[PDB]
């Protein structure tokens, strides 16, 4: 039931998503080992993901959370990077996209820094890099991230390194 709609680079909606992607790049403490060495991206395409059933699943749960948190869903737009993005856009997020050994336990992880999600595009620790060149810092191969609507509700605050 999923369809992808290409946004024009002239669309303000393209432009605000691009800016959120570009402006949240930072340096990483691994010197680029997982994700590569870059200060910015070449954006090739941005597509809107439309799926009625996945949307209604999301809005149903959002209402539930909201009603448990003084009518506040505490919704953000956050990045997700994964070798499973094609399964995710067609069938939605589920436990098979969990990070079983993540520092906050086994759930589905999201980032404010696009460059952080970029580190998981080829897998945990960047895996073995791009399928074609085995390069975690490949400048040639096309990568894909998701920019997602995430309901946080009442969020447990964990301070951490």
């Amino acid at each position: 039931g999923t369809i992808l709609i290409d946004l024009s680079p002239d669309d303000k909606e393209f432009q605000s998503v691009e800016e959120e992607m570009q402006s949240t790049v930072r340096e990483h403490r691994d010197g680029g080992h997982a994700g590569g060495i870059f200060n910015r991206y070449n954006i090739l395409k941005i597509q809107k993901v439309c799926n009625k059933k996945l949307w209604e699943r999301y809005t149903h749960r959002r209402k539930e959370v909201s009603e448990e948190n003084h009518n506040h869903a505490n919704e953000r737009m956050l990045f997700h990077g994964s070798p499973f993005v094609n399964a995710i856009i067609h069938k939605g997020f589920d436990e098979r996209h969990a990070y079983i050994g993540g520092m906050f336990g086994a759930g589905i992880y999201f980032a404010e820094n696009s460059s952080k999600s970029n580190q998981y595009v080829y897998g945990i620790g960047g895996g073995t890099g791009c399928p074609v060149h085995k390069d975690r810092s490949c400048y040639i191969c096309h990568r894909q991230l998701l920019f997602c609507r995430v309901t946080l509700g009442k969020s447990f605050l964990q301070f951490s390194a």
Partner: protein, 47 residues
């Protein structure tokens, strides 16, 4: 998949060392996220 801390819907990983890092978040139900935009890109080699 695990459960959120009781009384909570998610976790916020608040960085408390790397001054430049923004937050990371975890949810424990697939239905609390919608994948709105698919972005295709390349990282750029710095000059």
């Amino acid at each position: 998949m695990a459960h959120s801390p009781p009384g909570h819907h998610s976790v916020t990983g608040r960085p408390s060392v790397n001054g430049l890092a923004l937050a990371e978040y975890v949810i424990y139900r697939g239905e609390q996220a919608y994948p709105e935009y698919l972005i295709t890109y390349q990282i750029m080699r710095p000059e």
